Design an enzyme around this catalytic site. Structure first.
Site, mmCIF file in Angstrom:
data_model
loop_
_atom_site.group_PDB
_atom_site.id
_atom_site.type_symbol
_atom_site.label_atom_id
_atom_site.label_comp_id
_atom_site.label_asym_id
_atom_site.label_seq_id
_atom_site.Cartn_x
_atom_site.Cartn_y
_atom_site.Cartn_z
ATOM 1 N N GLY B 11 0.579 -1.580 0.177
ATOM 2 C CA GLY B 11 0.072 -0.066 0.005
ATOM 3 C C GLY B 11 0.596 1.471 -0.025
ATOM 4 N N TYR B 143 -15.754 -1.320 7.598
ATOM 5 C CA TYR B 143 -14.390 -0.840 7.415
ATOM 6 C C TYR B 143 -13.748 -0.515 9.273
ATOM 7 C CZ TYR B 143 -9.861 1.813 7.075
ATOM 8 O OH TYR B 143 -8.344 2.290 7.024
ATOM 9 N N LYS B 147 -11.506 -1.285 12.489
ATOM 10 C CA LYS B 147 -11.251 -0.443 13.129
ATOM 11 C C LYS B 147 -11.261 0.021 14.545
ATOM 12 C CE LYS B 147 -7.782 -1.091 9.961
ATOM 13 N NZ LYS B 147 -6.009 -1.126 10.370
#
Ligand SMILES: [K+]
Ligand SMILES: [K+]
Lengths: 318, 320
Positions: B11, B143, B147
């Site tokens: 990434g 997501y 998290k």
């Protein structure tokens, strides 16, 4: 009439909930499941309407839902505060993965899906007095961490996956049937037992540490009432529900005033106290009252009166 | 100097971080892993210092930790906002289970463990203006959900499991190297490229939707400073870090001003908008400033100038 599957049903909540719902909807509309066959002494023992299920096993879980076709699911299996601290690995495993299976199945087979949360979701930043429904959550137990996950993925399912997920945060649940364990809030149960055996109680929670507590029938009343409510009444997926807030000293007094004989209690501050001190003192459950008509029938004195009468009966005690 | 294992290193942050730490500590100090072989044209292609790792495989994870014996772990794998809405099962599989394995490994092998959080941890109840470190968390993405779990279990490991867990909440991160895709905050990159190509941009984020954003150099500044900080300055485990906030219209104004020519934008709401709408407008990162000296060097115009010079060079787009 709802067709009802309860998972993790050997627990105190699961057992009482099975019984209330049989009474309410008839024995044939209720299926309870748990890992093992009911112990011979357990209230669900021998009886039918019971199925073995490991909720970790998604295929077995889906099969059971395809077979029975419940309209309501109560996903109750959990590792709680105590054992959660001793084995965080297990706690995260069962609590997270089995919750994911429950929600997927409620989505797919369109079930109204109850998965309980808990005051252990809160930590010391919650605002400990009359803790709101929406607040900072900083659980300091694994159990708490997993239950916050439950809250968030469940709410996600409700909002984005058309899944009828519903939940309450249970405070300490007190029950005459529950043989008294090691859990944080179980001291209350222990105290009544000792008071009836006339022995000194060793209390691991501080004398003046307040906790939200709730008597089992009001708890069962709440769960069922929320499960019977209309989607359009529910502005929230997760609701605080309250009974009363008390310290060990106040419970001791309740029990003393009822028995007119005193109870010896030695405060021996265990790890229960450190957990308890991170939890709310009391809970604001006005969204529950307002949205779906939550109510309670037992105040501390009624619960005391009841417990002091029901334990001798259920436990062959004095 | 530390031994560094980076996971999910393909990434933007993984790559850029790999380079910064190769620089800071020496190539033989850094090991970078991801699921797939680096593409042809990729900064970590060919050369040594890269290993395949599937972080959902605990045994493979432990094995690599045993081999390399790092002292710093940067666990970067994640399925992010947009992809997670399309594959929620995969998002939870990797976001939850990989995180769990990295925490366990870092505890057992005594590593300082960085696992990023994100502005996706926040929902529409966070208090959207200068969102605090401690607030209501109601993420509306899978997501974000995963998290928040990350923050809580990581914070739990720090308090109770003697594990050096440290984290920031990343705003949207802008980099000249990233090729513009479908990510929630990718509109900013697209605008830059479209400016240089002189083509029309269709923006999926509402024209006045503010977001906390951060330029890659300041992002790497923050992570490294945090990873070097003394434990006794760290009052918290997770910290908001911020760079600037802006709307698409403000970013475009910056680009226009810099280029002395119009950028043509058409606003057609895409899926990024309802996600973005649920996020903060701006972050309060005062705790990061105070405790460990977090700071930044780019405002929007300075990032705009840099991006507009850097993209032509990194991508061969027409230059100024
Ligand atoms: K308390
Ligand atoms: K916003």
């Amino acid at each position: 009439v709802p067709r009802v599957l309860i998972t993790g049903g050997l627990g105190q909540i699961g057992t009482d909930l099975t019984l209330a719902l049989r009474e309410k909807f008839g024995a044939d509309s209720v299926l309870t499941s748990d890992l093992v066959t009911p112990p011979e002494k357990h209230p669900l023992a021998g009886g039918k309407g019971y199925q073995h299920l490991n909720c970790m096993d998604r295929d077995a879980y889906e099969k059971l839902v395809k077979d029975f076709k419940p309209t309501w699911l109560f996903h109750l299996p959990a590792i709680m505060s105590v054992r959660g601290e001793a084995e965080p690995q297990l706690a995260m495993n069962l609590n997270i993965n089995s919750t994911r299976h429950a929600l997927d199945l409620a989505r797919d087979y369109k079930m109204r899906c109850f998965i309980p949360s808990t005051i252990a979701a809160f930590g010391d930043k919650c605002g400990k007095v009359n803790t709101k429904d929406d607040t900072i959550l900083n659980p300091s137990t694994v159990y708490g961490v997993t239950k916050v996950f439950t809250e968030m993925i469940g709410t996600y399912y409700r909002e984005k996956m058309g899944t009828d997920f519903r939940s309450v945060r249970f405070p300490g649940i007190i029950s005459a049937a529950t043989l008294p364990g090691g859990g944080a809030t179980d001291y209350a149960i222990h105290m009544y037992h000792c008071a009836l055996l006339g022995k000194k109680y060793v209390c691991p929670v501080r004398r003046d540490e307040p906790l939200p507590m709730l008597y089992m029938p009001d708890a069962l009343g709440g769960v069922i009432k929320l499960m019977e409510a209309s989607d359009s009444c529910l502005k929230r997926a997760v609701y605080n529900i309250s009974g009363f807030s008390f310290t060990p000293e106040q419970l001791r007094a309740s029990i003393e005033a009822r028995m007119k004989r005193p109870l010896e209690v030695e405060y021996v501050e265990g790890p229960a106290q450190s957990i308890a001190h991170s939890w709310p003192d009391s809970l604001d459950d006005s969204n529950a009252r307002q949205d779906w008509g939550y109510e309670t029938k037992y105040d501390v004195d009624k619960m005391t009166d009841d417990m002091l009468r029901q334990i001798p009966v259920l436990h062959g005690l004095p």
